[PDB]
Amino acid sequence: GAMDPSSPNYDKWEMERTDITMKHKLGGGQYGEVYEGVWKKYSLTVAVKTLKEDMEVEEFLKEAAVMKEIKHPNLVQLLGVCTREPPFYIITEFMTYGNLLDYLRECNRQEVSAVVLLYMATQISSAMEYLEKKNFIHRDLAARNCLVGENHLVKVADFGLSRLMTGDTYTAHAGAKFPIKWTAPESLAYNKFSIKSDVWAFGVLLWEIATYGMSPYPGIDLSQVYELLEKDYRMERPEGCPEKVYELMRACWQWNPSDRPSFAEIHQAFETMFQESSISDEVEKEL
Ligand SMILES: Cc1ccc(NC(=O)c2ccc(CN3CCN(C)CC3)cc2)cc1Nc1nccc(-c2cccnc2)n1
Ligand SMILES: O=C(Nc1ccc(OC(F)(F)F)cc1)c1cnc(N2CC[C@@H](O)C2)c(-c2cncnc2)c1
């Protein structure tokens, strides 16, 4: 019996399907085959990713394998899998306040002050410093791919949104759907993805936080983004953004990937930046 520790077929991550009470599809279908679920014995709400009827079985099992290798307070936590027989499940913890992009756009601003936005950026930088140390690449870092929990807890996730999301967030490029405005120039021009191209996307994500979720490069056509960046254009400093924070965005957006800071340096910069000074005072001064 594969479920017993004695079994040489035992996998600690394999869970009993009957332990999960499957409820409705999450967020009106914005996540594809992801369902709200209840883990019986723990009376815990969970998020359950499944596969839609009938080659993507290998991508799904690869995601399950990657998730078993990663553990960080700011990375969505794997709780278990149902991969012995179809339908295949990936179970994670449910995050009360849902995705960060909608959260930023809908939040009460007296609550989600400059101090809270700084904490959210710092948490994301810690999750990314861990992925950098473990030699992983995210590939689609953005606010739409982060979740918000209790007490402004932020977790980085990866919802595989490219072929699910409606609108112009992701558009056709190199035979796939790219989020052009978050994509490092070497990723668009030379198909080069690395931790440094995640650094570039982090700079865009920082700008989303700094604007309460505004869409980047507003009013600029997607056909013009590469050319503008290649000619040294960069998004202007958001209104009220502290200069030290914008300096960090600009460092993320160096044309040469090798010139961008590592996530360890970005994380260290957030800790040091306001160790003595108040971000609240810097924002008030800027405004
Ligand atoms: C149910 C599930 C299944 C799998 C995943 N997976 C991930 O979030 C993830 C995170 C990091 C990696 C690391 N990886 C490194 C390699 N590169 C190329 C890709 C990323 C992989 C998968 C999340 C979830 N969780 C999830 N999914 C969709 C929506 C929600 C959700 C929505 C609202 C409230 N609470 C939770 N929660
Ligand atoms: O706090 C703010 N900015 C901030 C930036 C970085 C930062 O560091 C972190 F690391 F990124 F988190 C922390 C805070 C802030 C305050 N007031 C705003 N106001 C817009 C005009 C009035 O309404 C006040 C805006 C604004 C709103 N919409 C679009 N752009 C900017 C933003």
Ligand SMILES: [Cl-]
């Ligand atoms: Cl990887």
